[PDB]
Structure formats: structure tokens, C-alpha cells
Amino acid sequence: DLPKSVDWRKKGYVTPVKNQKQCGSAWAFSATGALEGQMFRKTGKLVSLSEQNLVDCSRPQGNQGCNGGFMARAFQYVKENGGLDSEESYPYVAVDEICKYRPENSVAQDTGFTVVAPGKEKALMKAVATVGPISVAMDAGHSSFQFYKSGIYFEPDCSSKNLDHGVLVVGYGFEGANSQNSKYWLVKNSWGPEWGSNGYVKIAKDKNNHCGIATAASYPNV
């Protein structure tokens, strides 16, 4: 069956933590983080991808740059657009700018995306175990999240339905010796390495889809 724990950062699928700064673009960081892992699975090369390309160019697909967006609409843009530029060639400035997509600088493609069944944490565990990092949405609107530092995050006021922040599940695990209790999702944030635990947070797992991590998960098909 599935592994008791998974951590794709230990296999080379994940880039160093980034910082979206004062721009509502976490959906773009979540999408590039999922496509970075799928392109690494496919080619063996880890290449940081451009959030700014997504902020500036995916309005036609329904995103609104620094005003918000959705990872599935980003993967739809990369498919429709035929590519996505590297972080190095199309740098992040955290403000809406003119679309400067350059095909010659493209280092990634996708044909669409796969959705995890909504609200199903075991479907998400299977996707994380067999595919690589997965884009998810969560309810991050709490000071307990803003000031998180360590341990398993559990917020009684969390919603599993009304979400406001895109993040990336890079694995799952458990504390202690028993693999079926005190479980958690390993989640990469885009608030810089200085936030949380080196930029990451353990979110309580199999506790009624806490903070909505399994409500709107998806990954690009490469």
C-alpha cells in the first residue's frame, strides 16, 4: 500500500522556499511548485519556474495577478500558452506588470491537470505518494497561522470550505512511533524561509480535512 511517510524535498523535487511579498500571488507559487516537481520527475532537472509569468499573463484564463487566482487556471494557462518561462528569465517583482512571455525561455509545459477528489484526504495521500508535490488551497486567515513556529498546526476556527490561500503539499508523516496517529501534511508556504519552520508548516492530517487541504487539490500533467 502507500508509504507511512513521504518527503519529496529529500528526493530533489522541491526548490528553496520563495516569498510572494505584498502581492496576492500564492496561487502562482503553488502552481509553479507543483510544475517544478512534475518537470523534475519527467526530466531529472530541477528548474525554478516563473510566478511573475503567471501573474502577468494568465488574466484570460481567469486569474487576477496580485488580486488572486487559482492553481488550476494557472495550469490551464500553461497548457493553452504552450509553455512557461524560468524564474531566472522572468523574475518576480510582486506587482502586476505587462505580460513578457518569451517562448525561447520556456522550460516547462503541461497538457492540463488532474483534480484530487474534493474533501478526500486519503485520495490526496495517494496523489502525494505516487505523483509528487500537490497544489492545494487552505484557510490561512488566522493569526495562529501567521505566527506559526513548530509542531502540528491545528486551528479550531479553520474552515474546510472557504479557503483563501494556495500552498504546496510536499509530503506527509507522523510524530512518534505509531504511523496511524498524530499525522500531518508537510506544506511548503510562499512567505519566505523565515516564516514558520524554515518556510514550511505541518498541518494536522486525517482530522476531518483540517483547514481544507484536500478540498481543492490538483497537479499538472506533464
Residues engaged in binding a copy of itself (CB under 8 A): 7, 9-12, 15-17, 40, 44-48, 87-88, 149-151, 193-194, 196-200
In the chain, alpha helices (H) = 26-43, 51-57, 71-81, 121-130, 143-146
Closer of 5 and 159 to a copy of itself (Cβ) = 5
Give the side-chain half-sphere CA count within 13 A for 53. 26
Phi first, then psi, for residue 145 (nearest 5°) are -85, -45
- Are 140 and 195 in contact by the 8 Å Cβ rule? The answer is no
CB of 160 to a copy of itself, least distance (A): 26
Q: Which three cell numbers stand for residue 199?
A: 518556510
Residue 70 partner contact from Cl ion, a copy of itself, none using kind-dependent CB cut-offs of 5 to 8 Å: Cl ion
**Using CB under 5 A, which of 23, 49, 72, 213 touches Cl ion?**
72
Find the binder of Cl ion among 66, 71, 124, 222 (CB under 5 A).
71
116: contact with Cl ion by CB under 5 A? no
Q: Is 170 in the site for Cl ion (CB under 5 A)?
A: no
Secondary structure class of 70 (helix, strand, coil): coil
Which of Cl ion, a copy of itself, none is residue 72 near (CB under 5 to 8 Å by kind)? Cl ion
Among 63-71, 86-94, 113-121, 145-153, the segment contacting Cl ion (CB under 5 A):
63-71
| Minimum distance from residue 165 beta carbon to a copy of itself (Å) | 21
Indicate the residue among 40 and 70 with the shorter CB distance to Cl ion. 70
Integer Cα distance of 23 and 5 in angstroms:
33
Q: How many CB atoms lie within 10 A of CB 92?
A: 21
The verdict on 70 binding Cl ion (CB under 5 A) reads: yes
Are the C-beta atoms of 136 and 169 separated by less than 8 Å?
Answer: yes
What does 96 interact with, of a copy of itself, Cl ion, none (CB < 5 to 8 A by kind)? none
Rounded to the nearest 10°, the torsion over CA 124, 197, 4, 164 is: -10
* Closest separation in Å from C-beta 208 to a copy of itself: 25
163 lies in the binding site for Cl ion (CB under 5 A): no
Q: Which amino acid is at 154?
A: F
Residues at the interface with Cl ion (CB under 5 A): 70-72
